[PDB]
Amino acid sequence: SAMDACFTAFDKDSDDRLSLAEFSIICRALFRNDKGHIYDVPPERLEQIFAVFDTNGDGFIDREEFKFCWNQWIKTIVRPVNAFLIVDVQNDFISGSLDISNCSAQQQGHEILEPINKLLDTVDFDAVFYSLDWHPSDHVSFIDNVKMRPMDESSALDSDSAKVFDTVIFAGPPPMKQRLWPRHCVQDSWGAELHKDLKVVDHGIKVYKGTNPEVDSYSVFWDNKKLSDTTLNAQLKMKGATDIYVCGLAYDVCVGATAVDALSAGYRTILIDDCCRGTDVHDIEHTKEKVNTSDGVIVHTNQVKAMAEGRDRRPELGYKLAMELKS
Ligand SMILES: *C(=N)c1cncn1Cc1ccccc1
Ligand SMILES: [Fe+2]
Ligand SMILES: [Zn+2]
């Protein structure tokens, strides 16, 4: 029903087909906000999307081709299924052994707590996940343990010259780069607890990462070698999640890693800038470029509610999804 009605209303031609020109009008209906702005879609990208749904190449989208378009593209743009992913908002990264405010950029991690809690209070997400760095005491990422594991011949620094925040390269095939951190987020420790003032909503799901002594996992998805993953992706699929809102600590390390993996996994991905803090101004900007160049978007807390409710529908996310629907 509603669908044929939509197709009918944009088939100006009345020829039971959709030209590129009539499709461009669909896009202008889709990619706008409700504060009076219509987003600009480059004509090149316009045809890129169009060609996804013109599955035979006839230069038209007929009512048979449009089924795929309506069910799998238009419906997600107008009614996304939103997951909120709160990364590593843990004691050791705010006031303990790895207080981000002591890193180079001197940013204060406690400041993300207010806007995150406000989002949790005002936006009805379809799922909320909280990740926790969850390291065993013998974890490879600690300066404390650099002597436990043989170093690679490629590494500039060995167990006797390495200092906290240096990068070493461990042997054990394959060779493995690892930045060394103070002991942090050890399992069952105060430093691994979620910050006491972070709201843990009742439906919230905790995802534990970094548990293998031999490999780190900055990302809530795959570990740093992309060998093993958490069950986050499987849990997202069980919820029908289409869109992932990512925040937390640190912007340029775990948040960024998680956001890039979410894009790799195929999700429409939104990084909430002011709900994040990072360790280094230059690496934060490199993280932003990565997300932007892979068709994620970066937004402020105040934009999230209208996006999640489908009242502010961004064309970068529409393009992401059309490119993913190629396969
Ligand atoms: C991810 N951000 C992460 C997980 N374990 C260590 N790190 C890096 C880091 C966290 C907090 C502050 C500074 C660096
Ligand atoms: Fe860690
Ligand atoms: Zn066609």
Same domain, 296 and 215: yes
CA 136 to ligand 1 center in whole angstroms: 15
Please give the order of strands across the beta sheet that includes 268-277.
205-209, 127-133, 82-87, 243-249, 268-277, 297-299
The values of phi and psi at residue 246, to 5°, are -110, 135
Beta carbons of 119 and 304 less than 8 angstroms apart: yes
Give 196's strand partners: none
88 lines ligand 1 (CB under 6 A): yes
Taking the C-alpha atoms of residue 116 and residue 89, their distance in angstroms, rounded to an integer, is 10
Same domain, 298 and 257: yes
Q: What is the resolution of this structure in A?
A: 1.8
The residue among 116, 90, 114, 94 whose CA lies nearest residue 103 is 94
Taking the C-alpha atoms of residue 314 and residue 326, their distance in angstroms, rounded to an integer, is 19
The residue among 143, 139, 90, 83 whose CA lies nearest residue 267 is 83
**Domain assignment present for 70:** yes
Domain boundary among 30, 50, 78: 78
Taking the C-alpha atoms of residue 44 and residue 56, their distance in angstroms, rounded to an integer, is 19
Mark the breaks in the chain: residue after which each occurs, C to N over 2.5 Å.
none
Taking the C-alpha atoms of residue 312 and residue 268, their distance in angstroms, rounded to an integer, is 14
CATH number at residue 21: 1.10.238.10
Experimental method: X-ray
Taking the C-alpha atoms of residue 324 and residue 320, their distance in angstroms, rounded to an integer, is 6
3-state secondary structure of 12: coil
Taking the C-alpha atoms of residue 70 and residue 6, their distance in angstroms, rounded to an integer, is 9
Who's near 108: CB < 8 A, 6+ residues apart?
Answer: 100, 101, 277
Taking the C-alpha atoms of residue 88 and residue 116, their distance in angstroms, rounded to an integer, is 13
What b/e readout covers 45-65, taking b as 16+ CB neighbours within 10 angstroms? bbeebbebbbeeeeebbbeeb
Taking the C-alpha atoms of residue 210 and residue 190, their distance in angstroms, rounded to an integer, is 17
CATH number at residue 275: 3.40.50.850
Taking the C-alpha atoms of residue 325 and residue 40, their distance in angstroms, rounded to an integer, is 21
Give the structural domain span for 37. Answer: 4-78
Mutate to test the pocket of ligand 1, among 94, 101, 181, 281 (most ligand atoms within 8 A of CB): 181
Cβ neighbour number for residue 323 with a 10 Å cutoff: 15
Look-up of token digits 């490119």: 323
